Amino acid sequence: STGSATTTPIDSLDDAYITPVQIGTPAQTLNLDFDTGSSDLWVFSSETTASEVDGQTIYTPSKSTTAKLLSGATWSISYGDGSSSSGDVYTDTVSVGGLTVTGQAVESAKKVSSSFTEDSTIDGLLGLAFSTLNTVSPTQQKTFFDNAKASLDSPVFTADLGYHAPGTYNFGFIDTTAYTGSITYTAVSTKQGFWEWTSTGYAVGSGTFKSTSIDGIADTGTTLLYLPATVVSAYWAQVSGAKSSSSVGGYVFPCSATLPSFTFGVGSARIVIPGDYIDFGPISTGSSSCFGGIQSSAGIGINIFGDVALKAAFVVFNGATTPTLGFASK
C-alpha cells in the first residue's frame, strides 16, 4: 500500500503545516501537524475541556462506530517549548492520503496548554518519531507509520514541505519526480527516539564550506533551524544590523536586509536554504525588526533541523530495520 497527502502551511510564514487525516467511521477529518520529533497521535476531542477549545475541529469517539476505549490508558506529553496536552486513548481507524491503519491509538485530549488553544488551525499532532517516545501508559502505543509499515510497498515516508506553498507527505514510496539530482542517505541514531543524524558542515552565503560534524534531529514539527551558537553567530554576522536580543528571544535583523543563504552538508552533498526562507517577518505587527529563522540551540540541548531546513529538501525517512535519512535538492 501507499498514501499521499498534501500538507499546507497554516499561515503566511510557514509556522507549521497541517495535513488532513480521516479518523473513525464515518470519517471525521481533522487537520493534524505531522511531527517527526514526537511519537503521539493526539487530537482535540469531545473530551477536551471546553474553555481550551477555540475553533479547532474535534474528534468525537462516540460518533465513530469503530472507536474503542483503550481501557486504562492515559497519555501526557510535554513539548520542548513548555506546551503540553494529556488525556485518554481510543483505538480507531485512521487514514492518511488513502493509506488506512486499523486499531491506531488515537489519543484524545482532555487538557491542552494555551499555546495549542490559540492555534485554531491545528486539530492535533501526528507523531512520526520512533515509537519508543510514545507517552501512552501503561502500554506504550505505536505511531501511525509503525502500524502501517508492514503493509507499505517500502517502509518509508517522505516530507516535501513547500516554501509559502503546499507540499506533500508520501507513505510507502519515493516520488522520483519530486526532487532533482540524487538522494544522499545518511545514518540515523534512534538512541534518543528521534531521526537523529550528523550533518557534515555548513556554509554561509557564498562563503567557504566549513567541514564540521553537527548532530541534530530532522523535526517537521519545529519551525526553525536551531544550530550551535558558533554556527549561528557566523551566519548572522553576515547580516548588517543583526543581533541577538534577549528580550525578543533570539536573533533579529532589520526587515530591510537581504539575507544570505545557508548551506548544510549531508555526506558529500549540500542542501542550500535560500535567504528568503530565513525571514520570519516582523517581531510584532508593524515592526521593522524581523525574526531570524536560524537560531541558537545552546539552550535546548540538541540541534534541530526544523522546517526552515527541511523545506529546502526532499526528505526520506527510511524506516527499514536500520533506519536512515535521505536528502535531495528540489
Ligand X SMILES: CN1CCCc2cc(CN)ccc21
- Residues annotated catalytic, as ranges: 35, 199
Asked if 307 interacts with ligand X (CB under 6 A), we say: no
- Could you tell me the smallest distance in angstroms from the CB atom of residue 194 to ligand X? 12
Which residue, 116 or 194, is less far from ligand X as judged by CB?
A: 116
Asked if 124 interacts with ligand X (CB under 6 A), we say: no
Q: From its phi and psi, is residue 301 left (phi > 0), alpha (psi between -120 and 50) or beta?
A: left
Q: To the nearest 10°, the Cα dihedral for 268, 273, 274, 278?
A: -150
CA distance 298 to 303: 8
C-alpha cell read off for 24: 473513525
Asked if 277 interacts with ligand X (CB under 6 A), we say: no
C-alpha angle 126-128-133 in degrees, rounded to nearest 5: 100
Asked if 122 interacts with ligand X (CB under 6 A), we say: yes
- Could you tell me the smallest distance in angstroms from the CB atom of residue 291 to ligand X? 16
Asked if 78 interacts with ligand X (CB under 6 A), we say: no
C-alpha cell read off for 257: 536586509
Which residue, 167 or 260, is less far from ligand X as judged by CB?
A: 167
For the four alpha carbons of 207, 208, 212 and 218, in that order, the dihedral sign comes to positive
C-alpha cell read off for 202: 555548513
Q: Which of 83, 100, 190, 238 binds ligand X (CB under 6 A)?
A: 83
- Could you tell me the smallest distance in angstroms from the CB atom of residue 286 to ligand X? 24
- Could you tell me the smallest distance in angstroms from the CB atom of residue 303 to ligand X? 15
Q: Which stretch binds ligand X (CB under 6 A): 48-56, 78-86, 174-182, 295-303?
A: 78-86
Compute and round to an integer the Cα radius of gyration of the chain.
Answer: 20
Q: Pick the closest to residue 146 from 161, 138, 156 (CA basis).
A: 156
Which residue, 131 or 263, is less far from ligand X as judged by CB?
A: 131
Cβ contact 71:61 at 8 Å: no
- Could you tell me the smallest distance in angstroms from the CB atom of residue 161 to ligand X? 14
* DSSP-assigned letter for residue 323: -
Q: Which of 39, 108, 199, 222 binds ligand X (CB under 6 A)?
A: 222
Asked if 119 interacts with ligand X (CB under 6 A), we say: yes
Which residue, 93 or 135, is less far from ligand X as judged by CB?
A: 135
Which residue, 81 or 215, is less far from ligand X as judged by CB?
A: 81
Three-class DSSP labels, 4-37: EEEEEECCCCCCCEEEEEEECCCCEEEEEEEECC
Q: Environment class of residue 121 by beta-carbon count within 10 Å: exposed (0-12), middle (13-18) or buried (19+)?
A: middle
Which residue, 56 or 263, is less far from ligand X as judged by CB?
A: 56
- Could you tell me the smallest distance in angstroms from the CB atom of residue 145 to ligand X? 16
Which 1-20 residues touch ligand X, going by CB under 6 A? Answer: 16
Which 99-118 residues touch ligand X, going by CB under 6 A? Answer: 115-116
CA distance 88 to 29: 20
Half-sphere exposure of 324 (CA within 13 A, CB side): 10
295 pairs with which residues across the strands?
Answer: 226
- Could you tell me the smallest distance in angstroms from the CB atom of residue 204 to ligand X? 26
Which 20-49 residues touch ligand X, going by CB under 6 A? Answer: 33, 35, 37-38
Which residue, 89 or 122, is less far from ligand X as judged by CB?
A: 122
C-alpha cell read off for 124: 492535533
Asked if 136 interacts with ligand X (CB under 6 A), we say: no
Asked if 195 interacts with ligand X (CB under 6 A), we say: no
CA distance 14 to 181: 25
Name the residues that contact ligand X, by CB under 6 A: 16, 33, 35, 37-38, 79, 81, 83, 115-116, 119, 122, 125, 221-222
